[PDB]
Amino acid sequence: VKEVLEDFAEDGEKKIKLLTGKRVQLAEDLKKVREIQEKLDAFIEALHQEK
Amino acid sequence: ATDRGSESDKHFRKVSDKEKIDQLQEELLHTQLKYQRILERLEKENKELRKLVLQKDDKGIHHRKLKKSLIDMYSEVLDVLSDYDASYNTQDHLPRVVVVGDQSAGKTSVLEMIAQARIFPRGSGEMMTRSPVKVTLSEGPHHVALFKDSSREFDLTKEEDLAALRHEIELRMRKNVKEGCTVSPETISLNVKGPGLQRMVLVDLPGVINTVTSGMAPDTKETIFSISKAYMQNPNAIILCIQDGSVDAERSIVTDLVSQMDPHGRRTIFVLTKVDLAEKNVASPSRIQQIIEGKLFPMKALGYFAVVTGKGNSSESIEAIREYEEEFFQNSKLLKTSMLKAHQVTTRNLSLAVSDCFWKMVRESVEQQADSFKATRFNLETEWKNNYPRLRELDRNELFEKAKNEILD
Amino acid sequence: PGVINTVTSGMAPDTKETIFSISKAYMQNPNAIILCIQDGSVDAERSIVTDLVSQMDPHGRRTIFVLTKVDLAEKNVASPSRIQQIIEGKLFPMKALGYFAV
Amino acid sequence: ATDRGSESDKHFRKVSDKEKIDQLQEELLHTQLKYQRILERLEKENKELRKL
Amino acid sequence: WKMVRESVEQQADSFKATRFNLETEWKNNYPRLRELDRNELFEKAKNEILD
Numbered sequence: 001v002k003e004v005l006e007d008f009a010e011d012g013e014k015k016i017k018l019l020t021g022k023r024v025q026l027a028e029d030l031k032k033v034r035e036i037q038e039k040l041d042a043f044i045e046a047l048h049q050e051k
Numbered sequence: 052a053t054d055r056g057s058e059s060d061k062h063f064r065k066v067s068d069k070e071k072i073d074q075l076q077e078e079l080l081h082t083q084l085k086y087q088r089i090l091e092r093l094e095k096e097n098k099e100l101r102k103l104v105l106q107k108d109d110k111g112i113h114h115r116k117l118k119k120s121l122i123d124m125y126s127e128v129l130d131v132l133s134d135y136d137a138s139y140n141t142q143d144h145l146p147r148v149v150v151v152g153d154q155s156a157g158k159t160s161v162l163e164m165i166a167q168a169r170i171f172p173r174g175s176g177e178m179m180t181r182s183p184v185k186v187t188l189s190e191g192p193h194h195v196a197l198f199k200d201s202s203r204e205f206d207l208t209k210e211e212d213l214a215a216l217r218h219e220i221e222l223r224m225r226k227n228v229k230e231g232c233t234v235s236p237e238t239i240s241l242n243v244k245g246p247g248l249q250r251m252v253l254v255d256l257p258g259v260i261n262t263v264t265s266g267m268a269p270d271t272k273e274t275i276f277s278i279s280k281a282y283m284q285n286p287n288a289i290i291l292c293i294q295d296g297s298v299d300a301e302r303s304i305v306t307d308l309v310s311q312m313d314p315h316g317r318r319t320i321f322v323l324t325k326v327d328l329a330e331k332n333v334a335s336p337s338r339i340q341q342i343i344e345g346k347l348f349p350m351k352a353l354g355y356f357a358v359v360t361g362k363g364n365s366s367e368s369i370e371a372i373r374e375y376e377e378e379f380f381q382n383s384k385l386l387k388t389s390m391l392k393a394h395q396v397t398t399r400n401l402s403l404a405v406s407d408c409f410w411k412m413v414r415e416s417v418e419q420q421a422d423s424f425k426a427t428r429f430n431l432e433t434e435w436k437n438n439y440p441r442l443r444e445l446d447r448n449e450l451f452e453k454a455k456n457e458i459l460d
Numbered sequence: 461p462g463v464i465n466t467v468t469s470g471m472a473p474d475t476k477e478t479i480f481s482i483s484k485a486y487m488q489n490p491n492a493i494i495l496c497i498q499d500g501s502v503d504a505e506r507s508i509v510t511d512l513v514s515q516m517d518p519h520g521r522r523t524i525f526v527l528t529k530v531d532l533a534e535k536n537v538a539s540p541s542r543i544q545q546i547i548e549g550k551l552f553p554m555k556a557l558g559y560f561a562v
Numbered sequence: 563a564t565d566r567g568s569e570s571d572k573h574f575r576k577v578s579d580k581e582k583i584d585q586l587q588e589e590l591l592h593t594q595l596k597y598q599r600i601l602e603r604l605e606k607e608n609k610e611l612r613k614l
Numbered sequence: 615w616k617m618v619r620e621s622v623e624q625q626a627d628s629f630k631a632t633r634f635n636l637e638t639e640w641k642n643n644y645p646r647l648r649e650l651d652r653n654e655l656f657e658k659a660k661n662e663i664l665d
């Protein structure tokens with residue numbers, strides 16, 4: 001089990017394929033949305049360097 | 052006697068510490084607890100030491116508000132967006148500049164003579180563009196472009212390096228295409244620096260084909276239309292409409308693609324390519340007088356209708372193309388006997404004018420995205436939390452590890 | 461008249477349908493011989509009238525395609541590979557009566 | 563909303579985050595983290611066998 | 615100024631808590647309540663009186 005779990009720990013595709021519970025995917029989307037908000041504001045903050 | 056495995060593994064684990072605890076305690080707990088903290092504080096120092104050297108190449112530190120990596124901020128935002136959501140639900144709200152025109156037109160020429168003539172496969176004989184190719188252009192020295200966002204170290208002024216770089220893009224172009232078509236929406240990310248490059252993102256969408264010949268898979272033209280939605284459904288997209296110059300406007304597909312996107316031309320500029328083919332056939336100056344006035348094109352594109360011309364040889368260097376373009380436009384009756392002054396026609400005016408319109412749209416619309424994404428998160432968190440009150444914060448890495456421990460337990 | 465399929469310059473929107481009717485009056489003739497005039501200053505991927513003869517003459521019994529501006533194949537203005545394939549006929553989504561150079 | 567656990571959880575989470583960014587943790591950002599570089603250098607000194 | 619940079623920033627937590635509490639009382643009891651300061655209430659009462 002330890003050998004297999006370590007293989008799964010490295011096997012991202014199976015982890016994605018196995019972990020499809022619709023809440024972690026929503027949680028993953030929320031993280032991406034949060035990252036984009038930072039990335040959106042970072043560029044927008046860079047636009048505001050004019051004044 | 053009831054169980055012996057637990058005793059053995061625990062006893063050997065206790066032996067491992069007695070001999071090596073003086074090294075394991077430092078590595079296993081002390082280092083790891085500090086490891087995360089030093090990432091924020093001490094890696095900061097090493098990042099800044101190199102970053103400052105990189106900024107000096109950018110000149111951002113030397114000059115206030117002027118930095119070549121400043122435009123790279125724009126691309127970083129889109130790269131996350133494409134990874135987060137590559138579908139129309141998000142892509143349709145992302146500002147961009149697209150190259151739209153007949154496939155025959157050689158529409159990509161508007162970008163080839165800037166940086167891409169050296170690293171992008173071109174020439175006649177076959178359809179070249181297979182999927183949207185986005186090029187991040189930035190004022191700077193010659194520097195090998197990023198290929199699929201991958202670092203490269205090549206000399207952009209020597210053929211041996213450029214030929215290998217042309218191969219790299221071609222591999223992405225064809226690999227993006229699957230059976231049943233010849234075109235794919237999967238995009239290719241390029242970021243190049245060099246002289247004459249403007250700060251903007253220009254995307255060479257695959258050329259539209261009126262009819263799907265037997266030399267192309269049946270779904271080629273339908274797929275291009277769907278890919279054309281990158282601008283047809285994008286109020287933040289700027290469209291460069293390319294008329295194949297040798298043939299007349301009523302025949303061309305691009306007329307309908309853009310006029311259904313913005314019939315007022317507010318989101319587009321009309322550009323003509325291969326105008327010099329007017330003098331390799333019986334030229335019509337009166338037809339060119341209708342071209343500049345947009346009587347010939349229904350999208351009523353705004354701005355000066357720039358024209359791109361070239362020798363037609365697929366080996367002409369960027370510098371050779373620029374010199375050929377200036378001499379031809381300043382003397383050809385196509386523009387000298389009509390109201391198309393060469394200094395407005397020249398491609399370098401389009402690049403500046405496109406860069407001017409690029410930042411106009413980006414600053415105006417980008418702030419709307421911040422409110423949209425924030426509203427999205429609140430609506431998603433409200434429903435997600437209500438249906439899953441237990442998990443206020445979850446990640447697929449946290450989900451796996453809990454199972455990993457749970458299974459072992 | 462040549463097919464436009466889109467109306468520009470203030471022209472009445474009915475022009476493309478009128479053109480198609482004028483041309484189908486003959487292209488729908490079972491015994492007619494159809495000569496498709498192809499602009500050779502463009503790649504083969506741009507062909508406005510192929511789709512019509514491919515429906516009115518899918519059997520290659522009337523339609524002959526002729527390539528204009530053949531000098532642009534010499535100059536590489538138009539893709540030579542697609543020109544060779546249209547000469548051989550690999551690019552037609554239909555049977556064709558023949559092919560000639562203009 | 564009345565007599566609903568979800569509202570209590572949301573209020574608790576907001577207050578907890580505000581406390582997490584409060585002065586209690588703000589001070590540590592200016593008194594502990596900036597010496598993690600010295601801690602890392604001391605870790606490097608400890609792993610070297612010269613002292614042993 | 616060191617104390618300034620160290621401590622002034624966290625005064626935002628209590629400001630946000632106060633705004634949250636006031637807006638919470640409003641949402642629960644005064645969803646129509648706005649920045650009804652010395653001017654707005656006076657104007658509304660004046661208009662009602664005149665009508």
Ligand SMILES: Nc1nc2c(ncn2[C@@H]2O[C@H](COP(=O)(O)OP(=O)(O)O)[C@@H](O)[C@H]2O)c(=O)[nH]1
Nearest residue numbers: 157159160173174179325359360361363364365
């Ligand atoms: N005559 C002429 N040829 C051009 C022009 N721009 C590009 N070309 C030719 O078109 C070929 C490839 O250009 P490209 O931009 O890649 O067009 P595409 O491959 O059809 O998308 C090269 O052989 C170029 O010489 C132009 O403005 N005038």
Ligand code: ALF
Nearest residue numbers: 154178179180258
């Ligand atoms: F000829 Al193209 F994209 F314009 F393949």
Ligand SMILES: [K+]
Nearest residue numbers: 154155157503
């Ligand atoms: K072409």
Ligand SMILES: [Mg+2]
Nearest residue numbers: 159173179180
């Ligand atoms: Mg191309």
